[PDB]
Design a protein around this ligand. Structure first.
Ligand SMILES: [Cl-]
Ligand SMILES: [Cl-]
Ligand SMILES: [Cl-]
Ligand SMILES: [Cl-]
Ligand SMILES: [Cl-]
Ligand SMILES: [Cl-]
Ligand SMILES: [Cl-]
Ligand SMILES: [Cl-]
Ligand SMILES: [Cl-]
Ligand SMILES: [Cl-]
Ligand SMILES: [Cl-]
Ligand SMILES: [Cl-]
Ligand SMILES: [Cl-]
Ligand SMILES: [Cl-]
Ligand SMILES: [Sr+2]
Ligand SMILES: [Sr+2]
Ligand SMILES: [Sr+2]
Ligand SMILES: [Sr+2]
Ligand SMILES: [Sr+2]
Ligand SMILES: [Sr+2]
Ligand SMILES: [Sr+2]
Ligand SMILES: [Sr+2]
Lengths: 377, 209, 377, 207, 378, 113, 208, 77
């Protein structure tokens, strides 16, 4: 095929459906009090990649501004742009933002992934409380439910604070942190067990991977020094609250994995990963992030296309011969009628020739007894 | 130690259909390979020995010169790359064809198609020539299972009768190309040992008609 | 912070941009144009196939790390529509529309955008001037739906006329370039001089001096020009479009047959729509190449923002204290009421705290006399 | 199918795994060897099994076509185990990855040729020894390669070493220890833990 | 692996040998009247890949010039740069160029082949005559002979014009040309015979593969239409002249293969391929190509000569640490004068920083015995 | 006319030439059309000094008689292009205010003939 | 020429610098205003001076065509001072870089147009105020620009402000303080310190 | 000639932050003496950092111009 790997056209009814989803989901966010912002696709790397992870840097294409000689990037993620925008416009209080726009990645993020996702998200700045994270969950699930999908969202919760506090209290080196993170990403229990026998507090690091899923009892399995760390206690408490909220309020299947440490760099606390059916890459990624509080989520709108349906469209062709037989005043009345049909969402083609045939034709608008009417084909 | 020709043969059906051609050129095996824990086999000609390899290794042994010549399916050659060997003869044996295949009467999904196949390079090439984007998944073993558990939408495989496809609820879809076994020769061996090769190649050529 | 020609669209502007994009897209769809959403990046093989030198300079280059091959970020969507029509459109008439971000290496006009939101429509496979008339109808229906006070002025040209004169008079490359330069600068004196010593130079002068009066242009031209069918047809096309625009749409139309921008890509009639007295056209359209016929237009949606208005939004805050005093069943009734308001497009914020204050607040939803009601601030 | 799909390797692994399965309530209903069947049901109706070539086990598991599987650590190392969870060392089918050459043939002083299935393992290993190599991918058996000069060494799994000695070869260097592991799809571990846990506890106990 | 496939250090004595070969071979070319040019490793693709084959394009790594946003390549071949240079500097007459420089390829040619060859070559622009091709052969063989190798260079001559004229005269399609070329490349005589029975002038195409090696009689085996084509006649004549010249003047083993059609794109006539012993990939590739400007030339990977060339053992000398530090200032100055002289003759002399300072591959110590500094082997 | 200029009878150095000029874009364009690589140095003030203190090898400047060049030990080298004053008009003003412009443009046009 | 070449700005800087030069033994032999001459000798035969437009001083110095120079900090900020050494604040020709607009006209609440010589300073300043601008480069005098709507503001150096008020303009925001600086070529500082040091000590002393 | 150890030891002994090290380095690269003097009035051991830029060229006397803590650092000596 002509197009690069991870790069696809969205065409015809799919494109129509994508446009409807983007618009409806955007409008929902707007009606919940989130301010829409539409930052540009390119910025100077100074702003775009300010405090970016090494991963975000590799994911961001570089281009040269010929007016200044300086480096620009094509955004791979919108969230840093929301930070920029909130710094200038948001003040010290609570601020809510939403967005929907194309982002580009240098490499697909997992197996067979897109490099051109249509990234839609919502973010709440300036609230320390777990209540902001709960509002976001409610907004997200209200959006998901509005889509009338048969596909089901599974939620995975994590919390980077727990491992970061253990890494502090155990005074781990960069090398040892990297190795645990790699082992966690693979849930390699045997090699982790070995590495943990020779690490300070290594028992706790093993417990995270082996018993992290059971959040009700995780605190009691941890060491005395871990159990007396308030941040560890609070983090585990936050997980329990979100889990309960999701099950009670939304009847959501929740799994816990406190060793989920993608974006160890940007995440500063609780994290959320929503999986659609059994698809490997999460549909929805969210979490706490970063002297200002912030939390949010984002998703690739394009990944909803396979799981969403619109009603059959009504595709109408005006009869060529009958139309060209009309006098000027008859034409004006027909056009008024066609305008009305279009206002109701009928797709009406005015034929250029007798062979002019819309794709997916469903009805003709035809002339009988001085009256134009629709009839199916 | 060995100054003669080393001949690489594929294991199963190719071996059966090749034995006649070998006998006509004076190169019968001394024993049954199936009932033998042996790797290098001598022949009735003392200048020729044979190796019995997995079919996908035939081009490897030949291009690197560990065998001077070999019999390999064109499916194997296409998948491997045949840039470093000489494809001297179409032996017109073990005919079949490379085909796409899917679940019986299952419609194409609207998303990007997943191909699960041994023949990864052939698959990429084929779907490229049809201007179609695919996600290819390498398999080393049998492929008929892949569509039935959703690993891929289609498979690429060699099909003769098609009985294996139908027995598993699969149907041939597209014809990719025709396949038969070929005689391949190492570049250096063709230059250095033509005198030993020529009679054997003339005999094979004659045996084909 | 941001590069020249790159801007945030924020808050109500972003909201307005979203409404415009969505409404104008839907209008095009209801006229029978198939929406396509090609990606932002392609291999230069396809993206810049038969591109002008200008389009090549305007297109940022990046490297596909999966193949080592060269990709571009699109500076224009039309070549992608060509690609799409080649694969999907067949030999008959086909209609496409689109709306997407494009990026340019340099601004076109003083302080102009390098990140326009390019919206357009294109008709492939029809030779007739009727296709160009349908496009005008679609465009003006869209413009009229915007309820602007700004007026669109239309300039029509037709590159065929000068190209036929250049052929029939057997002009060299040098002489063609010089006339084109002189036309672009409206340099009548130096044109008059150059034309005294050129074959059919009288006709080239006539284009510049009397081209605007399209009713009489044919009769002012030389005998050789008047007997060229292509010249006659071109002038006929201009007269039909002009009449159609004035009659059907009450459009101010000027004619300039010396308008030869995109001499390369244009193959016939051209349209340029100017908003008030803005130097760069809002809308550019005209005939081009697909042996496949093609005509279309495009515009930067973002340039409509200054000339379009939405109604003031209703931004509502629910009273924090009153809400938290509610029992479960009272909450459910309020939420039903809030859902209804949101369906009507009210922007309702559910406060996280007593200080939670939406930007641009217009109403509170408050509890008085056992009843929740809106009151302005 | 809403239950668990379990991917098993064909030959020796299947023999040594059957006991563990029976203890966790997941016996096969029939003999796979004498069956022209691809998907096998079990005594538990929420579990079915796939019988695959060993090198395909990680493929089916990471893509979610099987929720969990039994695979040799040699296979996992060669394949990459980034997209699965290696939950359990089952301590079955123990062997080790080794280099091997012709009996008492010395290493030539030039750049070595390795002929092996385990191309990635080979590259990694010889890299960690600061040694430059030319690697040749083989799909079939490897004992023949040194005997006809295809490579100087092979990389292969060795248990007793009887196959090596019977062909005039000898194990040379030890690369790493190998046993069969229980791998699980990342999503299946999150979505279907309730179905997995008893089976994993039973396997853990059976060890 | 530490280094990528097809990428190798050249270290120590090999590096020394590479430096000697590069330098000597460059100097030889210069003394034959070839002008040395040293173009850069990177250019804009406009110039670097101007009229490039599809193969050269795939072989060339792409990078972005951060100063202009434009596309550059890392050269995979120097010849296009010589074209650029000759366009600007060479005029209408004969011009001679030589070069030696690193080129990089995205993929190896040949199993375990290099992606980083040290490409050395010579090119003659502006001469139509077969005499230019003969001069190049003379230069090449003079260079090869200077290397005192035991390895033997075998030369294969081809000539793309012959098949191209037959393809024209027989009015073959793209499809049929590709199929014959594929069959030629594989020396598949049976399937070629079949395909040739059903092609116009197919007898001539079969003759190329079956009797092309016998260039004395090739013309007489060809069809009447072929025999009356001047370009076919001249081409066969050129082959006969080069063959004779190589055998007479240079005692070269020459084979003829008129079905050798690698670089059908870039070659426009006679081609030469020099193979070292039984190595599959040619050491030397040369032949006629395009500059309306005539051009012919050759190139080779200097690094592939390292295995077939030998230098004398080096003299690696260490001055005795203790003895040296016991010297008075005037004794030191005399020693240093002696050391300078040894170094001028190419002795590698280390002046030790410490008593443990030990040169790799040490062969001699310069030691003090009686009133005298002298070399003694270790 | 726009010209290159250098020190009187000073030879071209073998290295990459340095141009010191107000006319940076003209300089780049010109030396590009001659297929020559240059290093350009922007000057805002007078340019005759630059070659005399080694700031650049050449300058690009407008020359009429050339008396300024000779008086400073410089000589015109290459002719770049001819220069004269032009009447330029804003695009919008040409459309909106042609009635005011036309007589003035006709008068200028006539004053030139 | 083996001595030092000194680059001076035309006009006011030249007047205020002459004292410092005389104190360091480097008086001009003649009046530059009444001279058709480009390179001027001094009473010290190891020093000559160049009289340049102020914006060219950093250019001549960084490229080594002059070993040292006197330049306004406005010029240095606009040019970039990365390739020279800013050794001394000479505390002469004090003024300040400022925004300026029409007298008692309020700032419009839109994208501002800045018309200025000091394009880089302008971009930097309005960036540090988190404000988006359209900058227009001017080479000549700037006071006219707001009066004919070329831009809303200008950026310029202001001392008394008399020029602004006389044209109906007023200083608005203070950008930074400006004075003349002694800049030195990096190589000249290393190679010719022995010639420079006395002259730099004399300048340093002349300042306090 | 230069010697990075001198500034690195001063940066250690004065316990400078990343920010402050970067700023001094930028100022040193430009030999911006006025702005360096300002920044050094408010830095720990800032007198020594100023001395490097102002009197570093005179290596015979550099040790004697440095602070007591600097003069007693063996690596600096
Ligand atoms: Cl689609
Ligand atoms: Cl009726
Ligand atoms: Cl079938
Ligand atoms: Cl199909
Ligand atoms: Cl109300
Ligand atoms: Cl053993
Ligand atoms: Cl090879
Ligand atoms: Cl020529
Ligand atoms: Cl002596
Ligand atoms: Cl003059
Ligand atoms: Cl002159
Ligand atoms: Cl002078
Ligand atoms: Cl003032
Ligand atoms: Cl003032
Ligand atoms: Sr994000
Ligand atoms: Sr629902
Ligand atoms: Sr367009
Ligand atoms: Sr209206
Ligand atoms: Sr109520
Ligand atoms: Sr070449
Ligand atoms: Sr010799
Ligand atoms: Sr201070």
């Amino acid at each position: 095929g002509m197009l690069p790997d991870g790069v696809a056209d969205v065409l015809f009814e799919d494109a129509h459906k994508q446009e409807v989803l983007r618009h409806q989901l955007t409008q929902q966010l707007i009606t919940h009090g989130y301010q829409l912002v539409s930052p540009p696709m390119i910025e100077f790397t100074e702003s775009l990649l300010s405090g970016a992870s090494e991963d975000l840097k590799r994911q961001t294409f570089k281009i040269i501004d010929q007016l200044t000689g300086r480096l620009m990037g094509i955004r791979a993620d919108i969230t840093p742009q929301i930070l920029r925008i909130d710094a200038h416009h948001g003040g010290d209080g609570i601020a809510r933002y939403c967005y929907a726009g194309d982002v580009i990645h240098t490499l697909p993020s997992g197996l067979f992934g897109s490099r051109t996702p249509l990234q839609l998200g919502a973010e709440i700045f300036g609230c320390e409380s777990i209540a902001a994270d709960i509002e976001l969950i409610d907004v997200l699930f209200s959006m998901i439910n509005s889509l009338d999908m048969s596909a089901v969202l599974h939620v995975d919760l994590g919390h980077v604070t727990i491992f970061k506090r253990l890494a502090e209290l155990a005074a781990l080196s960069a090398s040892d942190t990297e190795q645990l993170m790699q082992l966690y990403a693979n849930k390699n229990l045997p090699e982790l067990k070995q590495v943990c026998q020779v690490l300070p507090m290594g028992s706790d690091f093993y417990t995270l991977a082996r018993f992290g899923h059971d959040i009700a009892n995780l605190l009691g399995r941890l060491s005395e020094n871990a159990q007396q760390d308030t941040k560890i206690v609070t983090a585990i408490d936050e997980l329990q609250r979100l889990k309960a909220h999701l099950q009670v309020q939304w009847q959501c299947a929740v799994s816990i994995d406190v060793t989920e440490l993608s974006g160890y760099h940007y995440h500063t606390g609780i994290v959320f990963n929503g999986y659609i059916n059994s698809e490997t890459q999460p549909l929805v990624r969210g979490g706490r992030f970063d002297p200002r509080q912030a939390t949010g989520f984002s998703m690739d709108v394009s990944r909803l296309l396979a799981h969403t349906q619109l009603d059959a469209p009504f595709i109408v062709l005006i009869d060529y011969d009958a139309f060209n037989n009309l006098d000027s005043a008859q034409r004006q009345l027909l056009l008024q009628q066609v305008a009305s049909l279009r206002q109701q969402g009928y797709r009406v083609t005015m034929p250029l020739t007798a062979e002019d045939m819309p794709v997916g034709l469903t009805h003709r608008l035809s002339l009988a007894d001085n009256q134009w009417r629709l009839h199916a084909v | 130690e060995f100054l003669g020709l080393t001949l690489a043969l594929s294991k199963g059906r190719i071996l059966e259909e090749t034995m006649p051609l070998l006998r006509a050129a004076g190169v019968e095996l001394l024993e049954d390979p199936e009932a033998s824990r042996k790797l290098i086999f001598p022949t009735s000609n003392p200048n020729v020995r044979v190796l019995i390899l997995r079919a996908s290794d035939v081009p490897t042994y030949v291009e690197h010169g560990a065998a001077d010549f070999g019999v390999a399916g064109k499916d194997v050659l296409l998948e491997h790359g045949a840039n470093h060997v000489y494809e001297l003869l179409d032996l017109k044996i073990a005919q079949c064809k490379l085909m796409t295949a899917g679940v019986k009467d299952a419609p194409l999904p609207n998303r990007r198609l997943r191909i699960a196949t041994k023949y990864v390079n052939v698959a990429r090439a084929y779907f490229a020539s049809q201007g179609q984007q695919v996600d290819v998944i390498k398999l080393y073993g049998s492929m008929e299972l892949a569509p039935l558990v959703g690993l891929g939408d289609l498979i690429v495989d060699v099909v003769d009768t098609g009985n294996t496809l139908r027995a598993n609820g699969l149907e041939a879809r597209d014809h990719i190309c025709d396949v038969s076994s070929r005689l391949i020769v190492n570049q250096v061996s063709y230059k250095r040992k033509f005198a030993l090769l020529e009679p054997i190649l003339d005999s094979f050529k004659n045996s084909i008609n």
